[PDB]
Amino acid sequence: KTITGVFNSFDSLTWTRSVEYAYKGPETPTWNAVLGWSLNSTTADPGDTFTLILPCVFKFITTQTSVDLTADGVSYATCDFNAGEEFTTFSSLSCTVNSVSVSYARVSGTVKLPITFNVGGTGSSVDLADSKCFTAGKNTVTFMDGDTKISTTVDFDASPVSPSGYITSSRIIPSLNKLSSLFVVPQCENGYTSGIMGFVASNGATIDCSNVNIGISKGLNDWNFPVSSESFSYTKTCTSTSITVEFQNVPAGYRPFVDAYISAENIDKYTLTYANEYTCENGNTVVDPFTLTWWWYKNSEADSDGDVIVV
């Protein structure tokens, strides 16, 4: 049978720092959620299942496929990780009650989940929905088990990057062994006449043309991600090494963006070179190409403004 209301509290949510990541954003590894659970042998039996919903959670920061609900060295349940990624706006746990050697009436305990939140990243339906999940500053993070809501408060730092310039982001999709990479054109307050956006992949990355998004967004959120995506006048070419989008008139208040899945040949680094051309209404063409090297980890030296770490 499927039972509900095993997870009964959200105890704490804290960020853990590492060599690579400095600013404490929702997508920044790693957030650790401590949750309270309780099981009653009269209402739950070995093999019964139960699920925890994690809205606005992109993935689990672990290579383990499961985590156990343990108390005093006894494993009372096993919960499989089900990352939302680009499939669903929420992540989940699919848990199963375990047979134990020590009979209990009621037992309670906690579990730690390593997670990163989703506040955008591409023009996909999932990322656009999740771009409205949180705002900079204080938020309430709510998980659900059946109809039971469990929640705690947290403070998310806004991105330190100015939204008015170009925006780049890359994020690993573990189940796919691909990454998504985004490029947002610099802001022209009153609209655009023309431009060229996109990136050329080199140094151990190819572009997956079957998973791309091209749209214009009505502004960006607190972490510089697109919040909407509408069609507009553009022509594009996508090859295994280059995605290039040439666009024409874009209305005021909109930001053109393009993202694609990337296949990396290793988990060391890949390089993207961005064309970055734009002409604001009434203005002159700006041509400002730049190159970034995206790293999966932190390399010994740190390292130029051109070296950035994926999330």
Tab-separated table of C-alpha atoms in Angstrom:
chain	number	residue	atom	x	y	z
A	1	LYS	CA	0.000	0.000	0.000
A	2	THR	CA	0.941	3.675	-0.458
A	3	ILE	CA	1.000	5.647	2.766
A	4	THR	CA	1.292	9.405	3.354
A	5	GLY	CA	2.535	11.732	6.081
A	6	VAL	CA	5.747	9.920	7.038
A	7	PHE	CA	7.812	13.090	6.562
A	8	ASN	CA	6.456	15.399	9.268
A	9	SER	CA	8.885	18.333	9.629
A	10	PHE	CA	11.403	20.466	7.801
A	11	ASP	CA	14.097	20.960	10.413
A	12	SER	CA	16.750	23.046	8.648
A	13	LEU	CA	18.083	24.107	5.303
A	14	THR	CA	21.760	25.104	5.070
A	15	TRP	CA	24.304	25.717	2.352
A	16	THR	CA	27.728	23.991	2.366
A	17	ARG	CA	30.652	25.761	0.710
A	18	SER	CA	33.450	24.389	-1.431
A	19	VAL	CA	36.577	25.630	-3.363
A	20	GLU	CA	34.529	26.419	-6.488
A	21	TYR	CA	31.361	28.087	-5.274
A	22	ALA	CA	31.452	31.378	-3.402
A	23	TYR	CA	28.056	33.111	-3.792
A	24	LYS	CA	25.154	31.472	-2.033
A	25	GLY	CA	22.458	31.032	-4.675
A	26	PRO	CA	19.569	28.545	-4.940
A	27	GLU	CA	21.307	26.640	-7.793
A	28	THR	CA	24.693	26.738	-6.077
A	29	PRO	CA	25.833	23.332	-4.673
A	30	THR	CA	25.222	22.280	-2.043
A	31	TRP	CA	22.050	22.855	-0.041
A	32	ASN	CA	21.365	20.405	2.706
A	33	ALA	CA	17.817	19.828	3.863
A	34	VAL	CA	17.248	18.068	7.208
A	35	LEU	CA	13.807	16.534	7.402
A	36	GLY	CA	11.961	14.783	10.213
A	37	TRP	CA	10.204	11.486	9.589
A	38	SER	CA	8.093	9.129	11.693
A	39	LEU	CA	6.904	5.519	11.105
A	40	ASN	CA	4.209	3.550	13.023
A	41	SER	CA	4.227	-0.253	12.702
A	42	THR	CA	0.382	-0.325	12.982
A	43	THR	CA	-0.011	2.003	9.957
A	44	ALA	CA	3.033	1.041	7.924
A	45	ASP	CA	4.333	-2.386	6.926
A	46	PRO	CA	7.576	-3.532	5.295
A	47	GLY	CA	7.183	-2.961	1.539
A	48	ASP	CA	4.688	-0.125	1.835
A	49	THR	CA	5.684	2.887	-0.186
A	50	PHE	CA	5.596	6.645	0.369
A	51	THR	CA	6.823	9.656	-1.549
A	52	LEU	CA	8.311	13.035	-0.638
A	53	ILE	CA	7.756	15.924	-3.079
A	54	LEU	CA	10.425	18.536	-3.453
A	55	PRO	CA	9.007	21.495	-5.437
A	56	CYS	CA	11.478	23.811	-7.196
A	57	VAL	CA	14.386	21.304	-6.699
A	58	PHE	CA	16.430	20.521	-9.820
A	59	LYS	CA	18.668	17.640	-8.669
A	60	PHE	CA	20.358	15.830	-5.760
A	61	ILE	CA	24.054	16.545	-5.229
A	62	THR	CA	25.160	12.944	-4.726
A	63	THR	CA	26.210	9.939	-6.737
A	64	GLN	CA	24.146	7.621	-4.474
A	65	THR	CA	20.890	6.375	-5.951
A	66	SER	CA	19.152	6.226	-2.545
A	67	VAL	CA	19.258	7.420	1.058
A	68	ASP	CA	17.984	5.504	4.075
A	69	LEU	CA	15.790	6.724	6.937
A	70	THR	CA	17.904	5.524	9.899
A	71	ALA	CA	17.684	5.941	13.672
A	72	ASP	CA	20.220	4.446	16.179
A	73	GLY	CA	21.843	2.397	13.348
A	74	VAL	CA	18.624	0.746	12.188
A	75	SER	CA	17.422	1.274	8.549
A	76	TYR	CA	13.672	1.784	8.683
A	77	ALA	CA	13.135	2.797	5.023
A	78	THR	CA	15.039	3.286	1.756
A	79	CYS	CA	14.282	6.351	-0.406
A	80	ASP	CA	15.303	6.432	-4.057
A	81	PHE	CA	16.314	9.823	-5.502
A	82	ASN	CA	14.171	11.071	-8.398
A	83	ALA	CA	15.678	14.339	-9.722
A	84	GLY	CA	13.286	16.738	-11.538
A	85	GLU	CA	15.994	18.121	-13.856
A	86	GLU	CA	14.409	19.263	-17.144
A	87	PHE	CA	11.640	16.696	-16.950
A	88	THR	CA	9.646	18.010	-13.976
A	89	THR	CA	9.693	21.227	-11.982
A	90	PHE	CA	9.956	19.175	-8.751
A	91	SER	CA	12.258	16.448	-7.488
A	92	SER	CA	11.029	13.530	-5.325
A	93	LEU	CA	11.913	10.581	-3.131
A	94	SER	CA	10.263	7.196	-3.764
A	95	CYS	CA	10.571	5.378	-0.428
A	96	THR	CA	9.830	1.848	0.744
A	97	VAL	CA	9.478	0.717	4.353
A	98	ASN	CA	12.175	-1.800	5.359
A	99	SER	CA	11.901	-4.937	7.417
A	100	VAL	CA	13.750	-4.529	10.741
A	101	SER	CA	15.158	-6.848	13.433
A	102	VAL	CA	13.926	-4.699	16.412
A	103	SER	CA	10.136	-4.441	16.729
A	104	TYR	CA	8.956	-0.920	17.151
A	105	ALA	CA	5.606	0.684	17.838
A	106	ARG	CA	6.604	4.211	16.712
A	107	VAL	CA	10.013	5.423	15.643
A	108	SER	CA	11.206	8.958	14.619
A	109	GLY	CA	14.369	10.277	13.071
A	110	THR	CA	15.897	12.703	10.569
A	111	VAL	CA	17.362	12.534	7.110
A	112	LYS	CA	19.781	14.847	5.246
A	113	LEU	CA	19.212	15.563	1.513
A	114	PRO	CA	21.905	17.291	-0.627
A	115	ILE	CA	19.985	19.393	-3.235
A	116	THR	CA	20.171	22.370	-5.537
A	117	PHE	CA	17.075	24.450	-6.336
A	118	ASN	CA	15.809	25.373	-9.781
A	119	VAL	CA	15.267	29.104	-10.439
A	120	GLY	CA	15.653	28.928	-14.254
A	121	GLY	CA	18.430	28.267	-16.718
A	122	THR	CA	16.763	27.597	-20.109
A	123	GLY	CA	13.642	28.456	-22.153
A	124	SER	CA	12.141	25.011	-21.307
A	125	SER	CA	8.649	24.856	-19.765
A	126	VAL	CA	10.169	23.449	-16.583
A	127	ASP	CA	12.799	26.226	-16.177
A	128	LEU	CA	10.366	29.044	-17.047
A	129	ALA	CA	7.948	27.697	-14.417
A	130	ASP	CA	10.710	27.378	-11.843
A	131	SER	CA	12.072	30.887	-12.579
A	132	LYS	CA	9.155	32.166	-10.407
A	133	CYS	CA	9.893	29.747	-7.528
A	134	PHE	CA	11.859	32.165	-5.288
A	135	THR	CA	12.835	35.826	-4.953
A	136	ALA	CA	16.018	37.261	-3.538
A	137	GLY	CA	16.061	37.371	0.281
A	138	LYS	CA	13.785	35.431	2.593
A	139	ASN	CA	11.751	32.554	1.192
A	140	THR	CA	9.697	29.668	2.529
A	141	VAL	CA	10.705	26.274	1.126
A	142	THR	CA	7.857	23.767	1.319
A	143	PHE	CA	8.057	20.037	0.723
A	144	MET	CA	5.045	17.745	0.691
A	145	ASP	CA	4.232	14.155	1.684
A	146	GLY	CA	0.710	13.426	0.449
A	147	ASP	CA	-1.339	16.419	1.676
A	148	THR	CA	1.091	17.221	4.486
A	149	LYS	CA	3.114	20.376	3.967
A	150	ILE	CA	6.449	20.750	5.680
A	151	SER	CA	8.301	24.041	5.413
A	152	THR	CA	11.236	26.101	6.660
A	153	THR	CA	12.627	29.537	5.920
A	154	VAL	CA	15.825	30.383	4.110
A	155	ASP	CA	17.611	33.387	2.729
A	156	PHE	CA	18.762	33.194	-0.921
A	157	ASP	CA	21.373	35.679	-2.169
A	158	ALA	CA	20.644	37.381	-5.542
A	159	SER	CA	23.183	36.966	-8.301
A	160	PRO	CA	26.142	39.401	-8.066
A	161	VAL	CA	26.178	39.668	-11.892
A	162	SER	CA	24.473	42.739	-13.329
A	163	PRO	CA	21.426	41.868	-15.435
A	164	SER	CA	22.105	44.634	-17.982
A	165	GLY	CA	25.157	42.914	-19.536
A	166	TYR	CA	25.304	39.508	-21.200
A	167	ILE	CA	24.340	36.516	-19.050
A	168	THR	CA	25.890	33.054	-19.272
A	169	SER	CA	25.079	29.979	-17.222
A	170	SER	CA	25.770	26.270	-17.472
A	171	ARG	CA	24.211	23.452	-15.433
A	172	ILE	CA	24.887	19.699	-15.322
A	173	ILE	CA	21.941	17.362	-16.070
A	174	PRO	CA	23.279	14.206	-14.401
A	175	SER	CA	20.869	11.595	-15.684
A	176	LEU	CA	21.713	12.695	-19.222
A	177	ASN	CA	25.418	13.280	-18.834
A	178	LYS	CA	24.828	16.586	-20.620
A	179	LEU	CA	24.785	20.228	-19.503
A	180	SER	CA	22.546	23.095	-20.471
A	181	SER	CA	24.261	26.339	-21.400
A	182	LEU	CA	22.496	29.715	-21.778
A	183	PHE	CA	23.379	33.016	-23.391
A	184	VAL	CA	21.227	36.176	-22.847
A	185	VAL	CA	21.877	39.226	-25.039
A	186	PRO	CA	22.895	42.453	-23.253
A	187	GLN	CA	20.049	44.774	-22.399
A	188	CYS	CA	18.806	47.423	-24.877
A	189	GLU	CA	16.195	49.352	-22.852
A	190	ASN	CA	14.079	50.402	-25.881
A	191	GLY	CA	14.380	47.316	-28.002
A	192	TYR	CA	16.615	45.848	-30.670
A	193	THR	CA	17.016	46.369	-34.433
A	194	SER	CA	19.238	43.276	-35.066
A	195	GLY	CA	21.810	41.002	-33.429
A	196	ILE	CA	23.672	37.713	-33.388
A	197	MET	CA	23.607	35.422	-30.379
A	198	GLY	CA	24.910	31.948	-29.720
A	199	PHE	CA	28.127	30.061	-28.978
A	200	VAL	CA	30.731	27.866	-30.631
A	201	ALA	CA	31.817	24.801	-28.652
A	202	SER	CA	35.395	23.626	-28.524
A	203	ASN	CA	37.883	21.771	-26.406
A	204	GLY	CA	35.722	18.744	-25.666
A	205	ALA	CA	32.098	19.822	-26.100
A	206	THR	CA	29.554	19.383	-28.819
A	207	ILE	CA	26.160	20.946	-29.062
A	208	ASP	CA	22.990	18.876	-29.014
A	209	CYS	CA	20.696	20.566	-31.589
A	210	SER	CA	17.739	18.411	-30.557
A	211	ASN	CA	17.393	20.214	-27.232
A	212	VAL	CA	17.551	23.951	-27.849
A	213	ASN	CA	15.478	27.012	-26.883
A	214	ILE	CA	15.327	30.381	-28.650
A	215	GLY	CA	12.942	33.051	-27.400
A	216	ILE	CA	12.540	36.513	-26.010
A	217	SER	CA	11.928	36.948	-22.240
A	218	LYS	CA	9.998	39.692	-20.495
A	219	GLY	CA	12.907	40.676	-18.229
A	220	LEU	CA	14.964	38.332	-16.098
A	221	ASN	CA	14.604	37.106	-12.476
A	222	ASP	CA	16.830	37.730	-9.476
A	223	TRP	CA	19.368	35.231	-10.796
A	224	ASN	CA	19.335	36.612	-14.368
A	225	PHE	CA	17.327	33.749	-15.818
A	226	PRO	CA	14.536	34.092	-18.457
A	227	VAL	CA	11.033	34.172	-16.906
A	228	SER	CA	9.065	33.840	-20.214
A	229	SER	CA	9.643	32.860	-23.811
A	230	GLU	CA	7.863	34.151	-26.906
A	231	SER	CA	8.556	33.614	-30.570
A	232	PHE	CA	10.058	36.507	-32.580
A	233	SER	CA	11.830	37.203	-35.891
A	234	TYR	CA	15.037	35.235	-36.189
A	235	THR	CA	16.912	32.733	-38.302
A	236	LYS	CA	19.100	30.023	-36.772
A	237	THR	CA	21.700	27.456	-37.677
A	238	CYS	CA	22.729	24.691	-35.393
A	239	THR	CA	25.619	22.239	-35.977
A	240	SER	CA	27.540	19.978	-33.604
A	241	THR	CA	30.017	22.831	-32.914
A	242	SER	CA	28.047	26.058	-33.305
A	243	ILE	CA	24.638	27.426	-32.545
A	244	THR	CA	24.005	30.841	-34.127
A	245	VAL	CA	20.820	32.897	-34.020
A	246	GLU	CA	20.452	36.070	-36.039
A	247	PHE	CA	17.503	38.166	-34.980
A	248	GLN	CA	15.772	41.311	-36.182
A	249	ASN	CA	13.291	43.518	-34.252
A	250	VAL	CA	12.688	42.817	-30.612
A	251	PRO	CA	10.335	45.044	-28.552
A	252	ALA	CA	11.321	47.103	-25.548
A	253	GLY	CA	11.307	45.251	-22.225
A	254	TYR	CA	12.377	41.964	-23.874
A	255	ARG	CA	15.670	40.026	-23.782
A	256	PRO	CA	16.616	37.593	-26.564
A	257	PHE	CA	18.233	34.410	-25.334
A	258	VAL	CA	19.442	31.052	-26.676
A	259	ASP	CA	20.310	27.873	-24.796
A	260	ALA	CA	21.316	24.369	-25.804
A	261	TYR	CA	22.271	21.030	-24.343
A	262	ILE	CA	25.991	20.341	-24.454
A	263	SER	CA	27.700	16.986	-24.662
A	264	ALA	CA	31.101	17.164	-22.935
A	265	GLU	CA	33.728	14.513	-23.751
A	266	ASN	CA	35.101	14.583	-20.264
A	267	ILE	CA	34.321	15.976	-16.851
A	268	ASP	CA	37.243	18.402	-16.859
A	269	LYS	CA	36.393	21.478	-18.926
A	270	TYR	CA	34.870	22.785	-22.152
A	271	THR	CA	35.146	26.107	-23.982
A	272	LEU	CA	32.448	28.296	-25.449
A	273	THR	CA	33.063	31.268	-27.650
A	274	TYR	CA	30.200	33.723	-27.902
A	275	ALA	CA	29.558	35.967	-30.916
A	276	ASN	CA	27.609	38.558	-28.946
A	277	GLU	CA	26.449	41.150	-31.491
A	278	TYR	CA	23.533	43.464	-30.936
A	279	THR	CA	22.086	46.732	-32.267
A	280	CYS	CA	19.719	48.632	-29.919
A	281	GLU	CA	16.916	50.618	-31.573
A	282	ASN	CA	18.245	53.972	-32.795
A	283	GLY	CA	21.797	52.823	-32.036
A	284	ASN	CA	24.980	51.477	-33.580
A	285	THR	CA	25.906	47.848	-33.783
A	286	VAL	CA	27.923	46.552	-30.797
A	287	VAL	CA	30.286	43.605	-31.516
A	288	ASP	CA	31.718	42.204	-28.299
A	289	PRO	CA	32.733	38.556	-28.638
A	290	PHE	CA	34.135	36.765	-25.607
A	291	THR	CA	35.311	33.262	-24.639
A	292	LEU	CA	34.628	31.329	-21.425
A	293	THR	CA	36.043	28.061	-20.222
A	294	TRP	CA	33.504	26.116	-18.172
A	295	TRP	CA	34.927	23.805	-15.541
A	296	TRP	CA	33.202	20.820	-13.739
A	297	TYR	CA	35.353	21.323	-10.633
A	298	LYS	CA	38.062	23.691	-9.345
A	299	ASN	CA	41.471	23.484	-11.061
A	300	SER	CA	44.561	24.067	-8.882
A	301	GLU	CA	45.146	27.694	-9.999
A	302	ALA	CA	42.231	30.130	-9.762
A	303	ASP	CA	42.268	31.505	-12.552
A	304	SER	CA	41.054	34.224	-14.905
A	305	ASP	CA	37.656	35.902	-15.207
A	306	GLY	CA	37.272	33.631	-18.291
A	307	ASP	CA	37.233	30.475	-16.118
A	308	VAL	CA	33.758	29.765	-14.646
A	309	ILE	CA	32.301	26.766	-12.791
A	310	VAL	CA	29.154	24.916	-13.860
A	311	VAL	CA	26.318	24.287	-11.337
